Structure formats: C-alpha cells, structure tokens
Symmetry: C4
Subunit: 360 residues, 4 copies
Amino acid sequence: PRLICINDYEQHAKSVLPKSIYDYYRSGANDEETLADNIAAFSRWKLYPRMLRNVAETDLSTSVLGQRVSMPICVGATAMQRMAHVDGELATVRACQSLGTGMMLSSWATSSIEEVAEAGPEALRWLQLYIYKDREVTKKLVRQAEKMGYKAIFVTVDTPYLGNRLDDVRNRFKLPPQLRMKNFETSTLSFSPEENFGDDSGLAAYVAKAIDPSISWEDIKWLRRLTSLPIVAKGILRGDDAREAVKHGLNGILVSNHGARQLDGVPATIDVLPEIVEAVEGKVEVFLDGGVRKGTDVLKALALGAKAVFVGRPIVWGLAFQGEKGVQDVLEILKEEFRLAMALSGCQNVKVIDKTLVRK
Amino acid sequence: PRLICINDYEQHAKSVLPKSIYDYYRSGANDEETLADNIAAFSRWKLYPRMLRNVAETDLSTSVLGQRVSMPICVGATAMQRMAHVDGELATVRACQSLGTGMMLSSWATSSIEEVAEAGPEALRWLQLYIYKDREVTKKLVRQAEKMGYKAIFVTVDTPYLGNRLDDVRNRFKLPPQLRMKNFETSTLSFSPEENFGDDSGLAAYVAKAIDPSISWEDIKWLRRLTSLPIVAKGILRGDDAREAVKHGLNGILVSNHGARQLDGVPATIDVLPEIVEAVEGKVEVFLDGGVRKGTDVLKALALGAKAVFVGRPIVWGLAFQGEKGVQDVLEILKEEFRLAMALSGCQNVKVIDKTLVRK
Amino acid sequence: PRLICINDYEQHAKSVLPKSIYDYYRSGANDEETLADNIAAFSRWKLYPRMLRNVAETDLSTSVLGQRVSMPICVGATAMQRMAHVDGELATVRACQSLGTGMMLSSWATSSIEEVAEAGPEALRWLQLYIYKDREVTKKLVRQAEKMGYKAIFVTVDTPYLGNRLDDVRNRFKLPPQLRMKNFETSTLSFSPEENFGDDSGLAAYVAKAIDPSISWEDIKWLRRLTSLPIVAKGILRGDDAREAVKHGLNGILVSNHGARQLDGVPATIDVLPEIVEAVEGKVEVFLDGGVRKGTDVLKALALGAKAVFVGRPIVWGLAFQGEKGVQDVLEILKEEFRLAMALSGCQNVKVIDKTLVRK
Amino acid sequence: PRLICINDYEQHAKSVLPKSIYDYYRSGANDEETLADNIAAFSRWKLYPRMLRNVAETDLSTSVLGQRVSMPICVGATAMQRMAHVDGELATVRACQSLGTGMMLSSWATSSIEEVAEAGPEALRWLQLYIYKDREVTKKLVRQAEKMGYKAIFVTVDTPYLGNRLDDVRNRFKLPPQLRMKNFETSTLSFSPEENFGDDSGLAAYVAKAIDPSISWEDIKWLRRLTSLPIVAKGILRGDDAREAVKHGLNGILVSNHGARQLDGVPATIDVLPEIVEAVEGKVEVFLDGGVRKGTDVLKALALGAKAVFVGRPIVWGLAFQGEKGVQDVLEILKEEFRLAMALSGCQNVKVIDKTLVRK
Ligand SMILES: Cc1cc2nc3c(=O)[nH]c(=O)nc-3n(C[C@H](O)[C@H](O)[C@H](O)COP(=O)(O)O)c2cc1C
Ligand SMILES: Cc1cc2nc3c(=O)[nH]c(=O)nc-3n(C[C@H](O)[C@H](O)[C@H](O)COP(=O)(O)O)c2cc1C
Ligand SMILES: Cc1cc2nc3c(=O)[nH]c(=O)nc-3n(C[C@H](O)[C@H](O)[C@H](O)COP(=O)(O)O)c2cc1C
Ligand SMILES: Cc1cc2nc3c(=O)[nH]c(=O)nc-3n(C[C@H](O)[C@H](O)[C@H](O)COP(=O)(O)O)c2cc1C
C-alpha cells in the first residue's frame, strides 16, 4: 500500500500486527487523556509564517550534544522492536545511518548494544538507560555503550514503576516466544516469555522485579560519576526538576511524558516545553518527544526552544510496514514535511526558527 | 468477566441489573450536565509529577476525623444497596473492614444500623443522616449510631426535596418487593413498595412525605447539641456556607453535589474544592465526593486540599458484580491506582501531596 | 405518550406535525449557530446553591409591568398557533388563565385580538406588535388591544425583514388552506395561502410586502405618543439600544434574538442579559427569552437580573401534544422545575434570587 | 436541484465532479486544521446588531483600489476552472460582469489573460501573479494584464513551494487531457498532463519546476518598478510583513492563508485580520479571503476593517452546477445574504459597518 504520511503507517501497522503487539505499541496509560493531548496540543499552537525570505536552499542540519545531525528529528527509545519486524533495532539503526540522524537505543531492546553498534557503526547512537536494582547490570550497560561508540546516556527518570496500560493488562502482554531483551543474561532480566510474570501485564511485572523504584537524585549523582559521556534526563515535566538536573551536572533534558504511557493526565510535552526551556536558562540543550507526527510539529517544538525532537511510535510503524526501508520512509516523510514547513514559514535553516513563529 | 478498572464494573453492572435499578443507580438530575462534569472536571486538572523522589515505600495511610484509615478513599452513602446484591450494606461493610477503610451508611439503607455494626464490628463506620420531619425518628437514628459504635454523623444538607431524576420518573422507581429501608418501623418511612408513593418517582414522593424541607442552620444547632459525635456537613458547594458550618461547631465539610443527583448545573466538586478549602482556613477537614473513578482523581483532590475522598457509584457496581468480593475488588483497584499515581508523581506518603502537583 | 420534560414535548411534536409545520416552528436562521447557543449558553452558567435556608414554602409569584403573575414564566408571541392544534391561540390563552400567567399574543396570530380576549377574559394578555407599512393597520391593532383589555405592547424591533430560515425556503412555507392571520382584512395582510408570495418562504415574502423596513426610533416616538399602555422593546441585544429605549420613555426591554430566527451569529440571550441589565440602571424591567427549557434556565435569568422570562417553542409543542391541556402541562412542568430549582438553591421567593447564585 | 445557500453548491459539486477534481478543489494542506478553522473562526465572532436604524434602502456598493464595485464580495483566483465546467474562467468573468463585481484571474488559469478580457471586457479584472523562475514569463504576464485592461496585480507571496495536499498526492492530481494552463507556451509551463510531473501531486511537481522558491522582498522591489498598476500582497499573515509590504510601496494586503492549502496550522484569516488592519495604520486597503461562505462572514470581515472579501471555492462549485449561471447564482446568494445581514444589523451602507458590531 501507498503510505504518504505518518498516520498512514499506523493504520497499516494495525492491519498487519497481532493485536497484543499493536496494542502494546499504541497504548497510553489508563484512560489515555495525555495520549490524545500529546497530539491535540500541537494543533493548538498556531504558526505565523514569514513570507519572501528566500527559501530556495533550506538547511535542516543541526547538532545534538555536540554531534552533527542531518535534521532535528531523531529516533527515540522504543522497547522490543523485533515484535514489529524480524530485524527490529538492526533495521532501525541502518535507517538512521542512511538518514544521517541518531538512534536512542532502549535498555529493553530485542537486540544487544553490541549487535546494534555492528549493524550501524557510522550511525550516531545513544543508550537509553533504566536504573536496575542490580547496579552491576546498570554499570555493564553504561560500560558497553562507551565501549561500542555510543555518544550519550539518556537516563529515563519517569519509570520507578510501569504505567498501567489497560490493553496490556487485558492481553496479558508478553514477548513472542522466539524473542528476548538481548542486553541481559538471565531468564528474568531478559523478560523470557517462559517466565512467571504474573497474571496481568508481563511488562509491569518485569519492571516491578527488575527496575529500582527507590531511584533518587543520589542515583543521578552516582551515574554522573560513573561515566564522562553526556547524560540527558529523560522524562522531566517540571521546571524545578529541570534546574535540579542542571545542578547535578547533566548535559540535557528530554521533556517527555514517556509517550503518555506512565502517569496519565500530565500535560502534553509541547505545552510544558516553554517552562522547561525558561527554567534551564540556556545552560543545557532541551529536547522533546511525545506526539510528533508531522513536519509542523517539529517546527513548533524548535520555535519553542527545543534543540531537536525524538519520534517513538512512528518508527515502530515504519518497521511494521517494511523494516529498514519502512523506517527510512517514515524518517524521509518527516524530513520532507519539516523542509516544507520551514520553507513555507520563511526559515532557511534551524538557527532562524524563532519564538514569533508560534502562538497558543 | 475480567474487570480491571472502575469503568469495567459499571459496564458489567448494566448487563446484570434490571433497568430500573441500574437507572436509579446511574442517574443524575434532569439533563445530567453536572453528572458529566463531575468526571470531565477531573480531566481538566493536569498533574505535574516530581521525578527521582524515592518511591520504593509508598504509605497511603491517613486519618479521617481523628480515626486512622488505610487510604484516603472511603465509601460514601448510597441508599438501598440490597437492590444491587442480596447482601447489600453487609457486604459493603465487610469489604471496608478488610480494606481498613470507612463506610458511610445511608439513612435509606436496606440494612439496619445495628445489622451493619454486627457485620462489620471492627470497621470504621459513620452514619449519613437525613433530617426527618419527625425529629424523634431522627434522634433515634443518631442515638443508634452512637450506641452501635459509629464514629461520626454526615448530615446531608442538599436534599430539602429530591432531585428530579428523569429515568426514575419514567420507570416509576420503587424498591423491589422483598426489600425495605430497614431503619424504620412504619410502611411509609420504610419505603414499602406496597405503599402509595404517587405516579412518578417513588423516591421523590417518599422524600416529600418524610424529609423536612424547612431544614435550616437552627436545625444544625439542634443537631450539634444532640450529639457529641463529630458532625460533617455533606453537600456544601459555597465558601460562605462552609464558613457557616464551621461557625456552628461542625467538624468537617464534605464538598458534594450528591453525585450530581440534586440540583443540575452546579459545578463539579473538584472545581469548587479549592474555594471551600480556602474558606475553611484549616479549621476543619474538607472531604470530596462526586466523579472519583481513578487513582489520579484521588491524587488531584488531595493535591487541592481534601483530606480524603468518598466513592458512591463504584461501590454499587462492585456489589452488582460479586457483593462483598466485588466491593473489595473495586476498593483494591482504587487503592492500587492511587499507589501508582503517588509513586509516579514522586509522593512517598499523603503528607507530601502538595498543590504544585496540579494546575487547571 | 408520557412526557415529563420540555424536550419530550418537542420530540412528540416532530412525530405528529407535518414536516413543513414542524420545520417552521423548530427553525433558526441560516446555519442555526445562535439556535444551538441559546441552549448551550444556559449550560455554561453554573449554579452556586445555598443550603439550609428553609424552603418549605416556596413562593414563585412576581409581577410584570405592575401586574401580578403566578410565576416569572410567561408565554411569548409565536405566530400561527392553529397550525399546531385546531384551537391554537384560544387554547393557549385558556392555559395561561388557568396557570395565572400572561400571554403575549403575536400580531401574526391565527386568532383575532378579540377572539383571544373572549377565550381568556381574566388572563393577563399583552399584544406583540409589528410595525406595518400601513400605519392605520398598526394603529388599529393597538386600539383593539386597548379596547380588549390587553395590558402592554411588546413592540418587535429586530424584524425589518424576515430572517432567512433555510427549511422554510426549501418547504416553500405557507399557511394551511383553512387558516389565516386573523387580525387583518385583506388577502395579502391575512397571509392567504391562495396568494402570490413568491417561490421561496411565503412568510419572508409576506414580511417584505407588509412590514416596514424603514422602522426607526422616530417610529418608537410615534408609538409612545399613540398609546399610554406600557411598551416593551422586544429584540434588543445591545446596551446602547437599551439606553435609547429608556430615553424614549419605554417601560421595559425584552432581551431577545427572536428565538435565533433573525440574525444568526448573535450571542445567546442569557449571555447578553447582564450587559443590558447594567445599561438600564434599574430604570425599566428587563425580560429574557430564547432557549428557556428548564426550571434552572428561569433561575439563571432571574439571578442575572431578569424580571421574568418568556417561552416560545415549548408552548407550540404543548399545543401539538394536546392543545389547551398540552400547554397547561408544559407550563406546569416549567413551574414545578422552577420551584424545585428554587428550593434546592435555597430561595424561598423570587426576591432572594441574587447574582451570587450564578457564575459563567 | 434547488440550491439555496453556498453549502448546497459544494454538496452538488461533489455529486457531479470526478473525485480527483473535487478533491483538488476541496482540499487543504496536510491534516486540514486551518481548512476547518477558516470556517469555525467566523462562528466565534458574534454579531451585536443595532435596531431601528432605517434599513429600507441598503446600499452594498464600495470600491476596491479606487474602482467601484456593486458589493464588497469579489472573485478570488482559483486555478484551472475548466475542470469544473467547459467554459471555466470565461463563465466566471461573464458572471462577474453581470454582478458588477471584480474577478481575480489565476496565473494558472485554463483560459488566457486575453481570452478572459474578451469574454468580460466591461468586468473589473485583476491578475493574480506567481513569480516564475523565468522572469521574462513573469514580465509577459504583467505586460499582458496591462495591455488587456486588468486593474491590479495580486502578487501571491505564500507559495515558494506548493502546500502538501494529501488527496492530490493520492490521486496523482493532473489536468484532464483536453486542458492546459493557457497563459504559457511550453509543455512544462502549460502543465501538460502528457508531461513528466513525477509520481506524486502533478501540481506540486509543476510548482517545483516553474515557481521561484528564492522569492524575496527584492523581488517585490523589482515588481514595484516593473508596473505602475496597483499591487496587492496576497498571502500575508503577520503584521510585520504587512508593514514591510507598505514600506515597499504596495497598495494593498490580501490577508490570506491560500484557502488553507499552503502551511497548515496557521490561524484563520478572520482571526489575523485585526492585527493586520492595525499594523497597516490606514495606509493601504486590507482584504480577506478564506472561509467566506455566508453574508454574515462578509459583515464580520468588514466590521473588523477589511475593505472587501474574496471567495475561492464557492465560485468553483457555482461553475460545477451550471457554469456562468451557477457562478451568478452563487454571487447573488452571497449578495442577498449580505444585504439581509446588513439590514438586520442596522447598517444602511458599508461605511457604517463598524467594529462594535463584532466581539470574539
Ligand atoms: C512502544 C513504546 C515503547 C517504549 N519503550 C521505551 C523504553 O524502552 N525506554 C524509554 O525510556 N522509553 C520508552 N518509550 C517512550 C519513548 O522513548 C518516547 O518518550 C515516546 O515514544 C514519545 O512519544 P511518541 O511515541 O508519541 O513519539 C516507549 C514508547 C513506546 C510508544
Ligand atoms: C445510587 C446512589 C444513592 C445515593 N444515596 C444517598 C443517600 O442515601 N444519602 C446521601 O446523603 N447521599 C446519597 N447519594 C450521594 C452520595 O453520597 C455521593 O455524594 C455520590 O454518590 C458521589 O458521587 P459518585 O457516585 O460519583 O461517587 C447517593 C448516590 C447514588 C449514586
Ligand atoms: C414558531 C415561532 C414563531 C414566532 N413568531 C413571532 C411573532 O409572531 N412575533 C414576534 O415578535 N416573535 C415571534 N417569535 C419569536 C418569539 O417571540 C420568541 O422570541 C422566541 O420564540 C423565544 O425563543 P424560544 O422559542 O427558544 O422560547 C416566534 C418564534 C417561534 C419559535
Ligand atoms: C481550487 C483552488 C485553487 C486555487 N488556485 C490559486 C491560484 O491559482 N493562485 C492563487 O494565488 N491562489 C489560489 N488559491 C487560493 C485562493 O486565491 C483563495 O486564497 C482561497 O480560495 C480562499 O479561501 P476560500 O476557497 O475558502 O474562499 C486557490 C484556492 C483553491 C480552493
């Protein structure tokens, strides 16, 4: 089928993925108020384009944490990508390498840190880290990322417990039989579908067993001493927490509500972005994810002070359509929509995308 | 059937309850504008969670009027519970005893004050009082509550006449043949379905015959002299009335619109809560009911200054599913959702649930 | 069928009236934005009831222009009532006489001024006047009203031309064959369905032929000199026009958008009421019509400073159900809903219905 | 079929036009947020009519850039009108001549500048100009307009690239075989459907090949030196760009979002109109297009300071119904709705249509 925008990809994915996998990928937490809002909020921000600016030569390039990227549109961590396509994370990293953009690799990937570095050696790669109760497991992940040429750690800070995703509970979500979380060396930590993970969501049970709910700023201190790699706090929604991340010597904030999958009824990320940008006082790069579907979404986040955005679900739908090629298609669609959004708004490059371009 | 959230319970209840009983339980007044709003309003209050607070050990316990409870989630008065399940109020009090939370017993219960105290002797129990034209009836109810170890009187002040519930009028609502309001000793006062209660809603006719529309602050004065038990004004919606309750030596306010069943077009209780908390100046505990369905609802009410919330309809749907076990399930679902909402918002206990957690 | 609220009456009317008649009665102008808003706006005004006020003895009585009425709910002018029921205006006035409220009689009634006075001699009656190009016709109507014991003139000021009601155009609306506008003595002025009234709405053509689009404040001056009866300006939507009516020695303002049938996209009458009440500075009574369907609508208009409200369409639906008895039913439903709305809001009588009862 | 308002015309058009042509005509850009808003925004602006102003003799006449018109309602440029009806632009100009209003002729017309001047010699005619990469092509268009008695140039400034219209991409939109853009003398520039215009929207490819994305204020300078005809900047959405147009010696601004077909998520034109009128300080006439469907839309734009409005899509639907006669019908409907909107709001002529008539 001919798919020409991101929404087309989701629709096709629903038609070809088994229910429990589609549901895992699509779902938000509880009543999914924030899931709807992540998208609605973008529509409330209106664009005020400048005309007659000469946009013959639009340059989409930028940098994330000192590393050059082809566009301010990067791949966010989405667990267990092999459920969507046999090649999962390997397909994803290859598409990123082709595009000249970065991939943030989930700690719960169905491919190892090493496997991913092998498949995309020239690709900009970062590790998304969950703090395990077992700090040696956690340390190993970080050390492996450093060894394998990953350029930053995105530490997820909004997941002391898993959000309650109703469909996952109903479907008793678990990995397909042939698949594992490939970063780990035990049946429990690798999320083996042959393992006892209770009678509800397998993933919620996995988090409860493996992930540390006691995670504090002290643990951020530990992490900051552990690695000299740039560290981004992922999942911040408040200006005071943002300032705290900066105080702790962190190098960035990813304004995120975990794609509306954690606490439901939190605001849309585009709505909190300005408070966070203001709080940080230019001291650290601020990124956004959550509900990015169109070039104009990217334009709005940048106008509001974000350095770059990350996409979660669109990538998984790309994979579901055609693995590597599907992901490349999705990224190219976003790139082209962004170029056009830039051109029609009078922006020659990302440096001239200013706050007067948007109003709520 | 597998029911995993409060809404699931309502759906099942509709499938197993006779129409007139389901309709009695579900209905609001007139066009049901406030009924919709009680729920919608919660969604408008957005959460601003703190991260990295150490939430390994979440403590949900609190106190209501000096009595310890396991969670700030209590059972509100809902008349005639035996329509939902053979055990009605007895099932309810047993579930409350198991949970370590309180039950507010309707004056229009299908089980006596004594029957309920016998079924849940260790349970925290309060009496919801309606002021009868017959003050000796009223006095008896209060004296019985004191004798039978009930810890407070919730005096309902928003029901000089019954609200107009359209479905009840259509169905000519009345008790099933085998059931009575068991606190009373005459055919009229016990709401006998064999009695003449007009051609419209039997309950509206019952109120008109039995309940005193002349109820004033003088009657509050009488009540305050009658018992030394704590007294909570239930059904207050204005700050000036709140201050008046405090002046009268009352010990609490339950901010309530009677589950949107009285005057339609009043605001949602979550929306008026702040005005009431402000009016009371910390002098008396303020509670809320109306539209509480999810853990995040409980979190929002507490963030806005409520000591605890009460649930009406969810309890009746629990009963409809499986009597005592159904009620326990509903309460446990609310408890768990609340725990998770607390954890994900960075709250170790109820004392740290502050106003910065919410914004309208 | 059992009909228990105003909406029930409209539904039944649609089932028993011929399409073109139902459509004439239901329609607003153009896209009907104001028609929807007249109702929606009432829902936006929220009620803040007082408790414990002693409402055993609710007194609904008031006065309109110095004449006592049983409730602040009166019958507004609706043309051609015999289309709805054989007895039309005669049924209506008889119901008003029974209720102890007033009837405002349309200049385009299917019953004469004299016929109506004969059918309801003791009923409070007012004449709604349209200014005809023929001033002798106009004068005759006024003189007849005076002779026949009518107590005021409601001069309609928002109809220099007829609003564009799309359904009427489609149906080529005209009177049924057996009926006339009975105040007039020629084929044209009596709106004979045997007459040439073009190929679009017969009523729009009738207005263009008969009604004076040149109507100015000078004509108000003429009217004010013509009769010593109280005169109310009906159809005012602006405070400046309100002040002008007062300057001209008029005795009242009916805040009206002609039931949303004239200019579409004007605000709801409940929304403009406050500006008008403020403009008038207590110098003249202010009334409202447009979208009144429920007792709480009446309560809100009074809280916002209206002396009384008028109902248009509900009366016609009463007629469609059962002529006189149907109208009486509709009025009694409104009366009872209003009583209950008063009682539940802590109002013993209309004098204590204050502005703190509502907030937008 | 009997069609009595603009919406009726669209509905009929959908029933008789081939899908790809209807879709081309109907579509907005991307998710069509602005397309919906262009219409919704008009409904948010509420009217505050004056009564008793004497509206017997309503005069709709005005002037655009010093040229008298019969009404402040003119025909906006819509490309390729022969797809809608065999006579296309020739039918349109004949209808405009009959109405005494102006036609703005698209540079992408399916009829030549000369053909159109021949068919409507007495009609007020303007040329809508796109700046071609080939400036000699561009110059020729301007010189032809001057020669053929066109009275102004509307330079479109919001189209450095074509907006992304999803349906056009899906349908692979192209001209029907028998048709060309008749102003041009090569296969590419005339948009020959036999030409290679890629695998997506033929029109997007045509723009990319033919239209200059480098267009700047320098090009406006060039245009202003090229012709002494009045020049209007079409597609301005910001006050700062408006001031820049004035500085450049331009004679007008058409506040336009290109009928929501360019950048999606820009505000409705009625919403930005006031900022633009304020920015211009009376120095230049300001016009509006986008979502004009009803007489009250025209009234609102004038109340907010627009000199006249242009209609795009309604004209094409007129054509689809009955070519010249269809266009005349559409224009006459708009004229009559506007007259009535004027009369009912107390406006004798366009000079008295003031800002107090509207409020958002
Ligand atoms: C299927 C799915 C799996 C996810 N897994 C992870 C994960 O493993 N680690 C993590 O930090 N965030 C995870 N997230 C959250 C994303 O990193 C990101 O914040 C979110 O997808 C952004 O919203 P979007 O999906 O609307 O683009 C996941 C999100 C989805 C939708
Ligand atoms: C079926 C039902 C019966 C009720 N009966 C009583 C009652 O007997 N006494 C009383 O004070 N309130 C009564 N109420 C109001 C409740 O105490 C409470 O305010 C309401 O149920 C809270 O809203 P919720 O149902 O959305 O949780 C009743 C409510 C319902 C839904
Ligand atoms: C069927 C119908 C006929 C009407 N005829 C008249 C009329 O003859 N004279 C007049 O001044 N207003 C007329 N009106 C307007 C009413 O007096 C009144 O303003 C309107 O009905 C109030 O809104 P409501 O119908 O929502 O109650 C008419 C309204 C309707 C609905
Ligand atoms: C089918 C169609 C074709 C259009 N072609 C042109 C064009 O050739 N040149 C131009 O400047 N604007 C073009 N526009 C934009 C219009 O001039 C105008 O801004 C728009 O139609 C106004 O919105 P409306 O269609 O809601 O009336 C086109 C619009 C439509 C709907």
